[model samples]
Target: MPCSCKKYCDPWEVIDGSCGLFNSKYICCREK
Candidate 1:
């Protein structure tokens, strides 16, 4: 499921997911 900000959002997971979702924005260089 898509993580919601209002409910529960893991900081690390969010960063990871964001990195995955938007490679350019998140700057995911390598595999996590």
Candidate 2:
């Protein structure tokens, strides 16, 4: 599923660590 992040979104996981800072992160905001 596509990440539907909110205002308080945090990096849920490190998809790849061999790249840029904001290019290897996932925002897995939990549902209400």
Candidate 3:
């Protein structure tokens, strides 16, 4: 998808809606 690298939103970004892999969702982060 668009921000392929955005998989990792900056910690200070206060935002995240596109991620699927380690450190996110069933992957980890979970707070998209």
Which predicted model would earn the best lDDT? 3
Best by TM-score: 2
Give candidate 3 misplaced runs (Cα > 4 Å): 1-5, 19-32
Each prediction's RMSD to truth: 8.5, 7.2, 7.0
lDDT of each: 0.34, 0.39, 0.40
In Å, residue 18's CA in model 3 sits off its true spot by: 3.7
Tell me each candidate's TM-score: 0.16, 0.23, 0.22
Which of the two candidates, 1 or 3, achieves a greater TM-score against the reference?
A: 3
Provide the global lDDT of candidate 3 against the true structure.
0.40
Clashes of 3: 5
Provide backbone clash counts, one per model: 0, 0, 5
Error of model 1, residue 10, in angstroms: 0.2
